[PDB]
Amino acid sequence: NVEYTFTGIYTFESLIKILAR
């Protein structure tokens, strides 16, 4: 978590969705 906080969560949320569909 550097700059993208909120969105970072959501963006990364998509990621997590990948490894855990």
Swiss-Prot record:
It comes from Rattus norvegicus (Rat). This is Sodium channel protein type 3 subunit alpha. It is found in: Cell membrane; Basal cell membrane. It comes from the Eukaryota. The chain crosses the membrane at residues 1-19. Pore-forming subunit of Nav1.3, a voltage-gated sodium (Nav) channel that directly mediates the depolarizing phase of action potentials in excitable membranes. Navs, also called VGSCs (voltage-gated sodium channels) or VDSCs (voltage-dependent sodium channels), operate by switching between closed and open conformations depending on the voltage difference across the membrane. In the open conformation they allow Na(+) ions to selectively pass through the pore, along their electrochemical gradient. The chain holds residues 156 to 176 of 1951 of the full protein. The sequence contains 4 internal repeats, each with 5 hydrophobic segments (S1, S2, S3, S5, S6) and one positively charged segment (S4). Segments S4 are probably the voltage-sensors and are characterized by a series of positively charged amino acids at every third position. Signal peptide: none annotated. May be ubiquitinated by NEDD4L; which would promote its endocytosis. Heterooligomer of an alpha subunit, SCN3A, and 1 to 3 regulatory beta subunits including SCN1B and SCN2B; disulfide-linked with some beta subunits like SCN2B. Interacts with NEDD4L; could regulate expression of SCN3A at the plasma membrane through ubiquitination-regulated endocytosis. Interacts with the conotoxin GVIIJ. Interacts with the spider beta/delta-theraphotoxin-Pre1a. Interacts with the spider RTX-VII toxin (AC P0DL75). Belongs to the sodium channel (TC 1.A.1.10) family. Nav1.3/SCN3A subfamily.
